[PDB]
Amino acid sequence: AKEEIIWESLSVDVGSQGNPGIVEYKGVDTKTGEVLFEREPIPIGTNNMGEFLAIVHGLRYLKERNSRKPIYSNSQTAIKWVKDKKAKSTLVRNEETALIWKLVDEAEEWLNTHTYETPILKWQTDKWGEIKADYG
Amino acid sequence: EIIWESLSVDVGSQGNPGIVEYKGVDTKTGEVLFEREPIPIGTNNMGEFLAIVHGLRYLKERNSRKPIYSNSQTAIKWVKDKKAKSTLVRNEETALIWKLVDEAEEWLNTHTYETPILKWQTDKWGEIKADYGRK
RNA sequence: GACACCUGAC
DNA sequence: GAATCAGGTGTC
Ligand SMILES: [Mg+2]
Ligand SMILES: [Mg+2]
Ligand SMILES: [Mg+2]
Ligand SMILES: [Mg+2]
Numbered sequence: 001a002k003e004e005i006i007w008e009s010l011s012v013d014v015g016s017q018g019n020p021g022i023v024e025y026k027g028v029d030t031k032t033g034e035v036l037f038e039r040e041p042i043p044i045g046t047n048n049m050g051e052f053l054a055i056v057h058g059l060r061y062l063k064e065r066n067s068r069k070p071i072y073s074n075s076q077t078a079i080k081w082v083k084d085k086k087a088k089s090t091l092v093r094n095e096e097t098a099l100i101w102k103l104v105d106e107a108e109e110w111l112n113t114h115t116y117e118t119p120i121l122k123w124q125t126d127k128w129g130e131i132k133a134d135y136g
Numbered sequence: 137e138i139i140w141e142s143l144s145v146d147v148g149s150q151g152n153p154g155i156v157e158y159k160g161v162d163t164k165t166g167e168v169l170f171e172r173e174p175i176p177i178g179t180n181n182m183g184e185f186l187a188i189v190h191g192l193r194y195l196k197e198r199n200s201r202k203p204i205y206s207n208s209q210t211a212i213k214w215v216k217d218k219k220a221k222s223t224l225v226r227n228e229e230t231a232l233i234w235k236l237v238d239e240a241e242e243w244l245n246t247h248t249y250e251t252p253i254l255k256w257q258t259d260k261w262g263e264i265k266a267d268y269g270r271k
Numbered sequence: 272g273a274c275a276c277c278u279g280a281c
Numbered sequence: 282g283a284a285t286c287a288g289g290t291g292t293c
Binding site: 014015016017018019021023046047048050051074075076077078079122125 | 273274275276277278
């Protein structure tokens with residue numbers, strides 16, 4: 001009943017214009033709201049692809065810094081894709097969506113070839129309100 | 137890109153739901169062509185819908201081929217469907233707006249028209265010409 | 272149903 | 282900053 005935000009964490013989120021549409025994501029320090037990583041907007045992608053990329057990017061980021069901090073996401077889909085090490089997107093694969101699909105292929109490749117200690121936690125929106133990395 | 141020889145429509149309110157009004161203007165001159173008397177209770181989208189259909193009736197009487205602009209994605213769809221899917225309760229308090237919506241639907245189901253109904257591109261062009269300002 | 276991401280409108 | 286009215290897609 002008293003699950004509480006772990007402040008010493010990284011929170012990730014996606015923002016879009018359309019879905020599918022222009023996608024971006026960022027990772028923030030949950031405690032300060034400081035931006036730790038982001039990607040330049042991607043012309044075409046889906047919310048779920050974005051959420052997935054943001055978690056994997058977070059894994060690589062924390063791994064390189066030898067960090068024990070957990071990552072929070074609000075995306076049940078992206079969390080499942082990361083644990084499965086496979087994104088199951090329906091987005092068409094063509095010249096238009098080549099960038100996002102390249103990134104998703106790369107993220108899967110990394111997952112399938114590395115280990116990591118980072119706990120990946122569901123952000124409890126119903127208990128805590130909106131995630132801290134939210135675009136709004 | 138803007139079709140200046142057009143009629144623009146928009147809605148005003150106090151509350152949503154609340155008191156609603158709408159009007160139509162010549163998109164080029166700003167002249168007000170019609171203005172609805174404030175209706176005591178209605179929704180924004182009921183108003184946006186009524187404004188469009190009022191514009192359609194106005195142009196039909198004139199056999200005019202000019203387009204109508206609205207900024208309401210919802211209302212544009214409702215007029216194309218001939219059905220205003222409002223969530224507002226229907227009772228004695230909301231009788232006037234629902235009589236108006238019911239009659240607008242009936243008009244759409246009993247007339248032909250060729251008027252193009254266009255989305256006003258608020259992002260590119262700024263606020264629609266029929267806008268009710270700030271209070 | 273659920274978890275998300277949007278679009279247009281005192 | 283807050284609220285309400287409406288119509289969408291991506292996924293489990
Ligand atoms: Mg999110
Ligand atoms: Mg968000
Ligand atoms: Mg309007
Ligand atoms: Mg307006």
